[PDB]
Amino acid sequence: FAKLVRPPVQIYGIEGRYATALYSAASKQNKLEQVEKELLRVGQILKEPKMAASLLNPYVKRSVKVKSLSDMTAKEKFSPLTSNLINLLAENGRLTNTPAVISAFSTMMSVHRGEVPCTV
């Protein structure tokens, strides 16, 4: 009981593999923008102060949230790489640290372009 430390938090492993295991196919189809830009919307939807209460409210439940997620993506017009990983985020109660998983996507995307020469 004397001093206190506060380390930052970003990129870890199972959360980073969620974006790299879904965008790994996007890297071959050139969807890093289709998956990195749509995933950011999930972080803003939970970061929003009016929407943050709806995602953390105890009434959304889990089975009901699965239908609300698919019924929201239908109006959000997500991309071909954002209507599957979205369920995993709301499948096992993963809407608390969901923005940290999107940040790892930007760091993993840098490793998909560094080893891919495509300029003339």
Partner: peptide, 25 residues
């Protein structure tokens, strides 16, 4: 507690494409 995951997003990619194997069991 609420835990128990095994790279589910990785196995899901194989179901949609599954085009990368190198003798691994």
């Amino acid at each position: 507690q609420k835990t128990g995951t095994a790279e589910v997003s990785s196995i899901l990619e194989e179901r949609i494409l599954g085009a990368d194997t190198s003798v691994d069991l």
